[PDB]
Design a protein around this ligand. Structure first.
Ligand code: CHL
Ligand code: CHL
Ligand code: CLA
Ligand code: CLA
Ligand code: CLA
Ligand code: CLA
Ligand code: CLA
Ligand code: CLA
Ligand SMILES: CCCCCCCCCCCCCCCC(=O)OC[C@H](COP(=O)(O)OC[C@@H](O)CO)OC(=O)CCCCCCCCCCCCCCC
Ligand SMILES: CC(/C=C/C=C(C)/C=C/[C@@]12O[C@]1(C)C[C@@H](O)CC2(C)C)=C\C=C\C=C(C)\C=C\C=C(C)\C=C\[C@@]12O[C@]1(C)C[C@@H](O)CC2(C)C
Ligand code: SF4
Lengths: 742, 213, 206, 73, 41
């Protein structure tokens, strides 16, 4: 049944298809009559399922493209490591991580840009990075530039390797469709092999090299006197000097008496009191448990060895009264369509990125991470944006599947059919709840603004006037604050310091974390978050459901997934496809994520961070003005935008000048997007004729006739420039603020 | 003759055709790349040859130095001699790295000719090899070159005894592969050569077997 | 049709046939696929191996004669930082001026074969070469060698030449690399190696 | 653009330091920092958690404008 | 080899080669002749 399947040498490697630019699609392989050929070439350059029709070639192309992407990622990683090795103040940072700003990039002195190499400390001059790579290397046990150089080379090797594979499995030994379809063995190997063995190997590295080196770094010894990471491998006695449990050998693990490993396999909440990060003796135990979890979970599905589940008997068995014929006919969907898999994978990966961004700020896993505010803010914002993009991509690919892979002749299996058969109800109720949330979230802010404007603050929705204390979040905080005493007797402390329990921790001045309060100003913004998320789901789900047909256009699936409009008739049918719904949902995703990152920035600078002095007095950065000034839009205008934007604007003539330049650059790009977002193709196509006339008058008429951008490319360009401008503006503002004041 | 069913390719032809393949790595349906049924027997053959050549040399110094024949240069562990510097190394007439590049230069000639005889059977008997152009033609299977040099004595004349010799060779090669794997592993949980492990097991197995560390 | 290759058992590529000297079928990347580029690359390699012969003879022999206690010329590395009657820029300008003429006439010979053979001052000298790259003539071939039987005395000599020139190229590149790895002369490398070929090699540094 | 130019020129004339416009307008961040960001300190402070003053109405209208403007999009 | 030259004759490759050569030229000029505001001719 399950076996290796390969077709020897299916495509001769050559340069013939390389000289003919358009070769994948026959419609544009002929040549560029007009200039709307250069555009759609790059447009459908990666539309593998559009060039051909057989799943086999599509799957082979997908495989090789994955290999190329992995090679590019490996080149990126090797470059980051080589820069940390050659142009970084890492060794100087290790001797004083609380007074040396990280930096791993230097600039050539050519045109006066030399001043971008600011004084970061340690006798170095370069741009201050915020990737958090220094903390990651300190937590990994890396303690010398040499140990970076090597791994850089290592990465490069893998890069080449990946490229080789990418060529091989398309040109010498490419599989056939029947091989990719074995999803049972694929999941078996990704659970047991990739995640399980990977976690086990990292737990091994931790428990062997990362624990003793980091412990000796916490004891205050010089990073040069620390023995090399192999002196703890060929000397169990030198390692047992810190964790004497190693003196007991590998015997406790095999006699099930491994409760004596409590030295390096701990269960302790809170953060390390000197590094402001998690206990590596805890993360080692965590990885050791996760590894065996994924390993025993990688034996569920059936292969050619008789035992195991089959993910078709599992599906059909779930078929209730309310839901027609259950999950029947879904195993046929997710093994004969690459899009219905990409949708689920993108949705789950985006949600997981959001979970990661929420967890890492609250439980700092790297030493001296919660101290460096710039890194902790960038790692939140970047990951939030990535997740917000991935979820919209999931929506788009679900729409694509519904448009050109769905068919009813087999989808009489009343689960997808049933949800398709009450879309007019799903979207109606989602619309109503969106309206309700929008009103009961934004009208409260408008109320507060009008009251504070009418000289009557006593009628506001503040924490002094009518209160809206979120009781459920407070109860959850109080419940997790008491867990290490009742509902977690073995855990020494709560999982995080953000819960109301616990106390403050300092890393030499600046504060790392403390219990976070929750008042009305948090109630309002959480409801605003819910409202924006709901509107985004509304747009995307409406597009996905009405991707096939609607009352307006009953044969929309014949038109396709991507098309501008079905005429100016029926009153007007502009922006009626699913691609246009993704276009419209990108802006609301941008809105939502921008509000989230503003929330996080202000709340952290106001109620979390700061610099404590002796006797315990702690003064936050802004001064705790979030609970009172964030209830009115004017407060977000002056106390957040106007006030905090005072660092970037006056950064000229300093090491933070590039942020001040990119502020205005991103403003220009954002405003430039409006030219494409507001205008239309006809005006520009007409205007181009009056320029072609002047060209013909002087015999400079090009042979590739200059047509204007299509109605869909205009929208694509507009949304791309809009997102670039907005995100780059927020990037520059956030960095120029937090680098100087954090 | 058991532990698997002779599905469609382990009929009984090859020397050592015990019909054992629970995964199906010789299945001729998907065969491209390196797991075709013509590369796997060859790979097993010469991996077993190298294991037979290594599982003897791993113990030879340690067992010879106990007879007092060799001077006290024979590293009682097979690994304290150059092959791994950090756990001990012996000083020879040259750097281990120049020894390594000399070994690679001498082995490139020894291996590229064999590769060309596998990929191109009749070749390596046409191009004038320097000095005495020797008759090293591909006399039959790329795993049994025959010849007046690779068969000094001509041991094995007709099909019966030659097939017996072949199956003996593949069985000894599998045994030697398992032996060198055991060397590699038990050099970690003990910290001493394999012959010393055997001696300490002969001392008393109740307190010196694997279940003591 | 019988000829030895750079890789026994392989097949010579289609664009290589052993007609031109020094041919061993070595062209993995296919850099000489079309003849329009082959007729250029052969001249490139010829001029290259000749210049490399000259450079190797200029680098290695004076170094030995300096170490042999005979000559006293400085090392080949720092022959630029010496005392000559004119600045290096002036000598370089004079070199370029003198070389423009020769290399232009050679270029015209390569592009249009035979278009440039007669002395433009005394129009009777008439260089005697016939194949591009081997200009012949009393100036470039005084001893008459070079005009012999069609093959086995000409082709043999030309391949025996390119065989030496490739070795010279490798040797001079190696001298260049060694003069930066080990900051000594190229003959000191050989001396230190022969003194202890076991421990004295490229691995004796890192 | 015309009204921005006129208003900044005359603000700097009436205050007393014409040499702020005469020197901070030749680049573009000067317009964003010395005209827009600087002259907005009493506008947005028309009302705050500490009270309100005569400019409050404008501090409303100002924000109002933005809303309507954004709704156009 | 002919198709390699044809591919190198494409629009993006010639564009990036030209713009990179021009960037190198301008960068060298500015590294050797910096802060040029008035033509001294
Ligand atoms: C340039 C050039 C390159 C890249 C090669 C390539 C090679 N030749 Mg070689 N040759 C080259 C020049 C020449 N070869 C040969 C004739 C041979 C022979 C007889 C052999 C090689 C062999 C080899 C290999 C030796 C590498 C090693 O193990 O160390 C290597 C693949 C050996 C090999 O195993 O290749 C299959 C080998 O036996 N070459 C001639 C004379 C015709 C050359 C003239 O320049
Ligand atoms: C064309 C081949 C050529 C090679 C291999 C070298 C070799 C070298 N020259 Mg150079 N040169 C060459 C052409 C010329 N040089 C010079 C005049 C100089 C000078 C003045 C200097 C060099 C230097 C150098 C070194 C630069 C580092 C390098 C070893 C430098 C050097 O030797 O420093 C150690 C140096 O100062 N060369 C002239 C003008 C006569 C040349 C014309 O062809
Ligand atoms: C929600 C978790 C869950 C549930 C409900 C089941 C349920 C089942 N498993 Mg199962 N399994 C699980 C997780 C689970 N498994 C995991 C995590 C692995 C790994 C396996 C590996 C596994 C194997 C290898 C086999 C089962 C089998 C079975 C079936 C017979 C077991 C029984 O009732 O006695 C039963 C339907 C047996 C069977 O025949 O199922 C069809 C069988 O051979 N399971
Ligand atoms: C796992 C990730 C993933 C994968 C594999 C795909 C794969 C695919 N997508 Mg898709 N997509 C994704 C994520 C992904 N997408 C996400 C996250 C979104 C949400 C934004 C979308 C939104 C989307 C739409 C709306 C469409 C696709 C389409 C496609 C198909 C053709 C793509 C193509 O030819 O593009 C070619 C690539 C380009 C033309 C590059 C454009 C340049 C980008 C827009 C700018 C990049 C900016 C950069 C970061 C910095 C700018 C500055 C610098 C340039 C100077 C292909 C199957 C199309 C289709 O028809 O599917 C069949 C289609 O219409 N996707
Ligand atoms: C600031 C600009 C702005 C505003 C206010 C809105 C408002 C709205 N958009 Mg929206 N939109 C905008 C820009 C804006 N959009 C842009 C630029 C785009 C392009 C990407 C879109 C794209 C877009 C899509 C694709 C969708 C929406 C939807 C919605 C509605 C969500 C329902 C809701 O929350 O109702 C709450 C409404 C408000 C908070 C408006 C203010 C109401 C005030 C507070 C009450 C005033 C009291 C009283 C009535 C005044 C009487 C006056 C009288 C006395 C004279 C809502 C009407 C969704 C929709 O239709 O869902 C229903 C939807 O699907 N929009
Ligand atoms: C900051 C944003 C921005 C920028 C930089 C531009 C830039 C430009 N626009 Mg423009 N435009 C914008 C926003 C913007 N627009 C908006 C929001 C609209 C309303 C839809 C327009 C409507 C518009 C029209 C109608 C025309 C331009 C034209 C032009 C060009 C004029 C030539 C020039 O100045 O160089 C130039 C490329 C003109 C053009 O094509 O120049 C020949 C032209 O006819 N634009
Ligand atoms: C499997 C690996 C391997 C292989 C194939 C060879 C192969 C060879 N070694 Mg060798 N060698 C090896 C590992 C290996 N060596 C190791 C690990 C060491 C310890 C550092 C040595 C130390 C060594 C010495 C000291 C000498 C050789 C010599 C030789 C050559 C003898 C003919 C031959 C090419 C001899 C030689 O140079 O010829 C010789 O004198 N070897
Ligand atoms: C039409 C617009 C325009 C014009 C006329 C100039 C003109 C000039 N620029 Mg300039 N520049 C421009 C746009 C322009 N730039 C833009 C858009 C940027 C941003 C990328 C720059 C960034 C820039 C830098 C960074 C430098 C110049 C420099 C110069 C001077 C060139 C000196 C030289 O290399 O010789 C010259 C006065 C150089 C100089 O020395 O100025 C005096 C210099 O260092 N410019
Ligand atoms: C929540 C409701 C819930 O408990 O669902 C339970 C019910 C699923 O019941 P069934 O037993 O039909 O479904 C089990 C399987 O058939 C697969 O769903 O779902 C519905 O009736 C549709 C949900 C629409 C929900 C409207 C909101
Ligand atoms: C010309 C040359 C040397 C010239 C030396 C000169 C002028 C001497 C200069 C000096 O005297 C002066 C001036 C001053 C002295 O005081 C010092 C020096 C400086 C020493 C070397 C060429 C050196 C050139 C070398 C070594 C080239 C090696 C190229 C190889 C092996 C290419 C192989 C391939 O191209 C093929 C064949 C086919 C493809 O399909 C595959 C690949 C691999 C791409
Ligand atoms: S978009 Fe194209 S189609 Fe839709 S209305 Fe405007 S013009 Fe008519």
């Amino acid at each position: 049944e399950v076996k290796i399947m390969v077709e020897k040498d299916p495509v001769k490697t050559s340069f013939e298809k390389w000289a003919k630019p358009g070769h994948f699609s026959r419609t544009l392989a002929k040549g560029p009559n007009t200039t709307t050929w250069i555009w759609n070439l790059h447009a459908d350059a990666h539309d593998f399922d559009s060039h051909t029709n057989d799943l086999e070639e599509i799957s082979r192309k997908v495989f090789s493209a994955h290999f190329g992407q992995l090679a590019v990622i490996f080149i990126w990683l090797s470059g980051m490591y080589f820069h940390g090795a050659r142009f970084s103040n890492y060794e100087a940072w290790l001797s004083d991580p609380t007074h040396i700003k990280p930096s791993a990039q230097v600039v050539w002195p050519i045109v006066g840009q030399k001043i971008l190499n600011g004084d970061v400390g340690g006798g170095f001059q370069g741009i201050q990075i915020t990737s958090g790579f220094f903390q990651l290397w300190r937590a990994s046990g890396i303690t010398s530039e040499l140990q970076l150089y090597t791994t850089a080379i290592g990465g490069l090797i893998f890069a080449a390797l990946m490229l080789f594979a990418g060529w091989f499995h398309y040109h010498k030994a490419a599989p056939k469709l029947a091989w990719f379809q074995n999803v049972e063995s694929m999941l078996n190997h990704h659970l047991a092999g990739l995640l399980g063995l990977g976690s086990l190997a990292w737990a091994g590295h931790q428990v062997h090299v990362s624990l003793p080196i980091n412990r000796l770094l916490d004891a205050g010894v010089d990073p040069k006197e620390i023995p090399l990471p192999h002196e703890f491998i060929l000397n169990r006695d030198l390692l047992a000097q810190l964790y004497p449990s190693f003196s007991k050998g590998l015997t406790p693990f095999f006699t099930l008496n491994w409760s004596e490993y409590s030295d390096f396999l701990t269960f302790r909440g809170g953060l390390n009191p000197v590094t402001g990060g998690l206990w590596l003796t805890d993360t080692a135990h965590h990885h050791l448990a996760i590894a065996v979890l994924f390993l025993v979970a990688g034996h569920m599905y059936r292969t050619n060895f008789g035992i195991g589940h089959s993910m078709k008997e599992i599906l059909e068995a779930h078929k209730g009264p309310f839901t027609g014929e259950g999950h029947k006919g879904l195993y046929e969907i997710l093994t004969t369509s690459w899009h219905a898999q990409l949708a689920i994978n993108l949705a789950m990966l985006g949600s997981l990125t959001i979970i990661v961004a929420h967890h890492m700020y609250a439980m700092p896993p790297y030493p001296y991470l919660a101290t460096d505010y710039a890194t902790q803010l960038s790692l939140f914002t970047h990951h939030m944006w990535i997740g917000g993009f991935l979820v919209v991509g999931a929506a788009a690919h679900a729409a694509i599947f519904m448009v050109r892979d769905y068919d009813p002749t087999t989808q009489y299996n009343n689960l997808l059919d049933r949800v398709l058969r009450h879309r007019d109800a799903i979207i109606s109720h989602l619309n109503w709840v969106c309206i309700f949330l929008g009103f009961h979230s934004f009208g409260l802010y408008i109320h507060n603004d009008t009251m504070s404007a009418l000289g009557r603050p006593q009628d506001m929705f503040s924490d002094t006037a009518i209160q809206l204390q979120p009781v459920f979040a407070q109860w959850i905080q109080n419940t997790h604050a008491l867990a290490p005493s009742l509902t977690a007797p073995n855990a020494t402390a709560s999982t995080s310091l953000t819960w109301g329990g616990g106390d403050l921790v300092a890393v030499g001045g600046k504060v790392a974390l403390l219990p976070i309060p929750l008042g009305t100003a948090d109630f309002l913004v959480h409801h605003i978050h819910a409202f924006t998320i709901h509107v985004t789901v509304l747009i995307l789900l409406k597009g996905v459901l009405f991707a096939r047909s609607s009352r307006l256009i009953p044969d929309k699936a014949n038109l396709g997934f991507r098309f501008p409009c079905d005429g100016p008739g029926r009153g007007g049918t502009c922006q009626v496809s699913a691609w246009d719904h993704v276009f419209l949902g990108l802006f609301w995703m941008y809105n939502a994520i921008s509000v989230v990152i503003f929330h996080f920035s202000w709340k952290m600078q106001s109620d979390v961070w700061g610099s404590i002095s002796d006797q315990g007095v702690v003064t936050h950065i802004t001064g705790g003005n979030f609970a009172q000034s964030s209830i009115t839009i004017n407060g977000w205008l002056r106390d957040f935008l106007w006030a905090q934007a005072s660092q970037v604007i006056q950064s000229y003539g300093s090491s933070l000048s590039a942020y001040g330049l990119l502020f205005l650059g991103a403003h220009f790009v954002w405003a430039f997007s409006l030219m494409f977002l507001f205008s239309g193709r006809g005006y520009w196509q007409e205007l181009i004729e009056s320029i072609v006339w002047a060209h013909n008058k002087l015999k400079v008429a090009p042979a590739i006739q200059p047509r204007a951008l299509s109605i869909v490319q205009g929208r694509a360009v507009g949304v791309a420039h809009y997102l670039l401008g907005g995100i780059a503006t927020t990037w520059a503002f956030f960095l120029a603020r937090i680098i100087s004041v954090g | 003759f058991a532990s698997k069913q002779s599905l469609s390719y382990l009929d009984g032809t090859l020397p050592g055709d015990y019909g054992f393949d629970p995964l199906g790595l010789m299945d001729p349906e998907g065969a491209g790349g390196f797991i075709d049924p013509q590369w796997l027997p060859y790979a097993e053959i010469i991996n077993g040859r190298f294991a037979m050549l290594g599982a003897a040399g791993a113990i030879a110094p340690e067992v010879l130095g106990r007879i007092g024949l060799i001077p006290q240069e024979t590293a009682i562990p097979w690994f304290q001699s150059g092959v791994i510097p950090p756990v001990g190394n012996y000083s020879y007439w040259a750097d281990p790295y120049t020894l390594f590049v000399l070994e690679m230069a001498l082995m490139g000639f020894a291996e590229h000719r064999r590769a060309q005889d596998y990929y191109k059977p009749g070749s390596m008997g046409k191009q004038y090899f320097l000095g005495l152009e020797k008759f090293l033609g591909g006399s039959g299977n790329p795993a049994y070159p025959g010849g007046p040099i690779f068969n000094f004595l001509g041991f094995g004349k007709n099909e019966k005894e030659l097939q017996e010799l072949k199956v003996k060779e593949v069985k000894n090669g599998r045994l030697a592969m398992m032996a060198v794997l055991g060397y590699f592993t038990q050099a970690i949980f003990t910290g001493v050569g394999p012959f010393q492990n055997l001696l300490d097991h002969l001392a008393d197995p109740v307190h010196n077997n694997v279940l003591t560390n | 049709n019988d000829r030895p290759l750079w890789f026994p058992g392989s097949k010579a590529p289609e664009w290589l046939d052993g007609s031109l000297p020094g041919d061993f079928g070595f062209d993995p990347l296919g850099l000489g696929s079309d003849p329009e580029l082959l007729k250029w690359f052969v001249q490139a390699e010829l001029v290259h191996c000749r210049w490399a012969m000259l450079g190797a003879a200029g680098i290695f022999i004076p170094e030995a004669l300096t170490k042999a206690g005979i000559l006293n010329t400085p090392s080949w590395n720092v022959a630029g930082d010496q005392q000559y009657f004119a600045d290096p820029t002036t000598l370089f300008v004079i070199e370029l001026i003198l070389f423009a003429w020769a290399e232009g006439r050679r270029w015209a010979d390569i592009v249009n074969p035979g278009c440039v053979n007669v002395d433009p001052v005394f129009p009777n000298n008439k260089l005697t070469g016939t194949d591009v790259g081997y200009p012949g003539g009393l100036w470039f071939d005084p001893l008459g060698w070079g005009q012999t039987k069609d093959a086995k005395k000409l082709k043999e000599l030309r391949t025996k030449e390119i065989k030496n020139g490739r070795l010279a190229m490798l040797a001079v590149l190696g001298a260049v690399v060694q003069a930066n790895y080990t900051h000594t002369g190229p003959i000191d490398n050989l001396l230190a190696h022969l003194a202890d070929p076991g421990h004295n090699t490229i691995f004796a540094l890192s | 653009w015309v009204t921005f130019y006129w208003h900044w020129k005359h603000i700097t004339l009436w205050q007393g330091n014409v040499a702020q416009f005469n020197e901070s307008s030749t680049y573009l961040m000067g317009w964003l920092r010395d005209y827009l960001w600087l002259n907005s300190s009493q506008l947005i402070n028309g009302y705050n958690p500490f009270g309100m003053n005569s400019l409050s109405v404008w501090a409303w209208m100002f924000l109002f404008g933005h809303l309507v403007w954004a709704t156009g999009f | 080899m002919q198709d390699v030259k044809t591919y190198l004759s494409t629009a993006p490759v010639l564009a990036t080669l030209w713009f990179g050569f021009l960037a190198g030229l301008l960068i060298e000029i500015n590294r050797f002749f910096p802060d040029a505001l008035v033509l001294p001719l």
